[PDB]
Design a protein around this ligand. Sequence first.
Ligand code: 6RO
Length: 282
Amino acid sequence: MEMEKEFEQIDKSGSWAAIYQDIRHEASDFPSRVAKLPKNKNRNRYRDVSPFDHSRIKLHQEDNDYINASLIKMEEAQRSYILTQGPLPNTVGHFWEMVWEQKSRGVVMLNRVMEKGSLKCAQYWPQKEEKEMIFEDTNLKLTLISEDIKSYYTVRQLELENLTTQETREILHFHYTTWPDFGVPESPASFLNFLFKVRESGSLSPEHGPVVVHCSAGIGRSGTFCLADTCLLLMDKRKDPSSVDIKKVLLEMRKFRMGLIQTADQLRFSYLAVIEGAKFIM
Ligand SMILES: CS(=O)(=O)Nc1ccc(Cl)cc1
């Protein structure tokens, strides 16, 4: 079926939970043996969220190459994304090592450091220009260059230096700051505006490594971001845009990381975002 009318048909019939459970039943199951090794317990935020072995990002290190991060490679859309958990106190150096080694331009953050009164990820970037951060375990230096605070999101320019080689690179930090503590946003308008700002920066384009996207677990809000981006790109590429099937795209993405889209409300919000976004594109 088309999307917008499939949408109204699920609303009128109130069957979002049944649609979402079908997706969960059909989703791929692949091994995640490296994630579950005892030496990696303090590298995982949640025991039930792990990268598959076949698609995990490897650190360029011979001691321990593990990080909770996955490469999502979308062949028809010609887009790639790295989806990862919010960094932990003992993985902030690994996080920036990955950004460096994978040649990423942008980092997309969809959570606040504290939500619901608890810490959802480490404070992993500097908050003042004159107070830079040094990660001694991976030999990197990170400096805040500029910050632009808007009503729904903040964009930061960061300088990452590889201290071994003295090479430097500019990284863009796109921080969506207004996702509610409970539920999903009422309108997708600010989320779509944010997606378009990431696109306009070059961070999603083939001349760079894949964008790094995270929330707390790296599967819920993060899944919504890449699912919406890929669906809108396919609607532009194809002769028949009504042929784009958001459930089929989601199942393809779940071949590369488990659990993408965590609730039926997130599934409905993803439909809403793609539907509204397709009208603005034209
Ligand atoms: C103009 S500026 O001060 O050099 N701006 C700047 C500095 C460093 C980086 Cl990585 C990016 C931009």
